[PDB]
């Protein structure tokens, strides 16, 4: 159990371009293609990522690859961000994965926006961060996922994934 395994549970694996619960197009393991409604712009984003004509279908290996780069970018994003970095540094290993998970799903700037929730995590007020984490658009968008991540931060265990 780590970020790689946690994300696999949260995102699934699809070798064909798909729509998320918001109508956006993703592929592989949560790799965002485009928020534009056209399936063709999505195919286009795709061939540019891969470097080939894909017709909206990729190999599993290509999926794995993308995933690695994505997890790597989520970590880079936490490390260069002045608001997230001091938080991250302060967390144990389990909670760290919970933050990389939000970042992979919302981006550095989107997570950097959870001002109250980050103040609480930074101060080790786990119950109160969980409550603040729930008052968000994120949670109203993807509550089941958000609920598993918030339990991780609350508890510091892999309980919601087990």
């Amino acid at each position: 159990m780590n970020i790689f395994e946690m994300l696999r549970i949260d995102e699934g694996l699809r070798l064909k371009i798909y729509k998320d619960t918001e109508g956006y197009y993703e592929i592989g393991i949560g790799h965002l293609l485009t928020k534009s409604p056209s399936l063709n712009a999505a195919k286009s984003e795709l061939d540019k990522a891969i470097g080939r004509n894909t017709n909206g279908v990729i190999t599993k290996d290509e999926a794995e690859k993308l995933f690695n780069q994505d997890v790597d970018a989520a970590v880079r994003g936490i490390l260069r961000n002045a608001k997230l970095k001091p938080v991250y540094d302060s967390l144990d290993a389990v909670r760290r994965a919970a933050l990389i998970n939000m970042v992979f799903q919302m981006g550095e700037t989107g997570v950097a926006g959870f001002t109250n929730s980050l103040r609480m995590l930074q101060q080790k007020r786990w119950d109160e961060a969980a409550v603040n984490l729930a008052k968000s658009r994120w949670y109203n968008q993807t509550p089941n996922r958000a609920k598993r991540v918030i339990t991780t931060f609350r508890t510091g265990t892999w309980d919601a994934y087990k």
Partner: peptide
């Protein structure tokens, strides 16, 4: 997704 996405604090609002």
């Amino acid at each position: 997704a996405x604090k609002x």
